[PDB]
Amino acid sequence: LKKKQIKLETTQVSGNFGTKNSSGQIVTEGNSWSDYISQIDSISASI
Amino acid sequence: STAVQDSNGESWNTGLSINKGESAYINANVRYYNTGTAPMYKVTPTTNLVLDGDTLSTIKAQENQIGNNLSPGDTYPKKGLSPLALNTMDQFSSRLIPINYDQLKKETTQVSGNFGTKNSSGQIVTEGNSWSDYISQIDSISASI
Amino acid sequence: EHASTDQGKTVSRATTNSKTESNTAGVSVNVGNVTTNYSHTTDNSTAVQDSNGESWNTGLSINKGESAYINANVRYYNTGTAPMYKVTPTTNLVLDGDTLSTIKAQENQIGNNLSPGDTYPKKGLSPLALNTMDQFSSRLIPINYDQ
Amino acid sequence: EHASTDQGKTVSRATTNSKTESNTAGVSVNVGNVTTNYSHTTDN
Structure with a gap:
């Protein structure tokens, strides 16, 4: 308690996306981005 | 005789x-x-602390x-x-890691996680894909290099 | 266990005033002549103490109930x-x-896996550490006082 | 149960000064001659 900015650091950000299940309905449950992330950066480039 | 004192x-x-039992609380700083x-x-390493x-x-x-993901x-x-912070010990992240009284004068086992396959399309799923199942199969049919 | 130390300085000044009144009266006799008297005394006394x-x-x-907490070191x-x-052994402790x-x-x-x-x-x-007893890994294994 | 022991040394120095003033006065008589006096005393 006696004590640039290193307080705020941000690692992985788990979340979900949305697809259609059987109609024009949208669902978010089960759509973790965290799965496709690791695939992408190794087959892509960051700009 | 009348006498009067006033002390202040x-x-x-x-x-x-x-607390000789919970004499300090541990907090690690780790890099996977x-x-x-x-x-x-969904990387989850168990950590032997010696x-x-x-x-x-x-x-x-x-x-x-x-x-x-890794x-x-x-x-x-x-x-x-x-490095990140391993601050607690139980399954809800409430109670920090304790040590003995005489302790204060003074390792990586299994790493449970998952992989990804396709279910019915070009979709990927991680749920239910524990590596920990196939691990024991491999090292007995393979060699480490 | 629970251990503690408590140390602290103290300082106390203390003054006291006093007034004492004294009326005496004596009666004497020389046989072989009589003499009598009575005195009167007035004293005011100031005193001061300073203790520290x-x-x-x-x-x-x-706690005779939770007098120590157990922690094992085991090898399956x-x-x-x-x-x-997913190995999960139950452990009789005697x-x-x-x-x-x-x-x-x-x-x-x-x-x-094993x-x-x-x-x-x-x-x-x-060997690894079996530190707790209940289903969430929060509370270490206890023993009696005479244990 | 909950048991506990509590033991601790104590040390206390304490000085005190005092001044007492004393004015007395007596009256005597020898019958068969009168004498009177009054003293004054100062003590620190």
């Missing part, structure tokens, strides 16, 4: 009490790494120290950041 | 033909003849 004083007191061929998802020869405790890290050759946290 | 002390105190309190092993996955408690280890002391002839932890490491 001021006291000080500095106290210190200690992967050397093999496959990416691991002082002299004995083991302070063992932490199967909870959702806080967890690792979402490409081969990458690290968690990734190359740019500082 | 320092105390020490070392305390120790104990398998001798049979089949690999076991002091004299009785049983301290029984721990169905939780996710922390669990074992992911090939036949292998151990957990495997051959290279040191």
Whole structure:
């Protein structure tokens, strides 16, 4: 308690996306981005 | 004889009490790494913690120290950041890691995670894909290089 | 255990005033002439004290119920033909003849996989730690006072 | 149960000064001659 900015650091950000299940309905449950992330950066480039 | 006294004083007191059982709380700063061929998802390492020869405790890290994804050759946290914090010991992240009174004078086992397959389309799923199943099969039919 | 020390300085100034009145009266006789008297005395007394002390105190309190917390260091092993996955051994803990408690280890002391002839932890490491007793890994294993 | 022991040394120095003033006065008589006096005393 006696004590640039290193307080705020941000690692992985788990979340979900949305697809259609059987109609024009949208669902978010089960759509973790965290799965496709690791695939992408190794087959892509960051700009 | 009539006599009258009027005293007035001021006291000080500095106290210190200690729990020989929970005498301090541990907090680690760790960096995960992967050397093999496959990416691991939802990384959860169990952590043997040894002082002299004995083991302070063992932490199967909870959702806080967890690792979402770990490409081969990458690290968690990734190359740019500082190591993360393993602050607690039980399955809800409430109680920090304790040590004995005489302890204060003074390792990585299994790493449960998941992989990814396709269910009915070009979709990928990680749920239910524990690596821990296929591991024991492999090392007995293979060799380490 | 619970240990504690308590140390603290003290300082106390104290003044006191006093007035004492004294009326006496004596009666004497020389035989072989009589003499009598009576005196009167008035004294006002100012006095001042200044004490200062320092105390020490070392305390120790104990719970005869939860008098210590147990922590094991264990090594699993398998001798049979089949690999076991998600290994969870229940552990009878005996002091004299009785049983301290029984721990169905939780996710922390669990074992992911155990090939036949292998151990957990495997051959290279040191034994792991069974630190707690209930299903969330929060409360260490207790014993009696006379235990 | 909950058991506890508490033991601790104490030390207290204490000085005191005092000044007492004393004015007395007596009256005597020898019958068969009168004598009177009054003293004054100062003690620190």
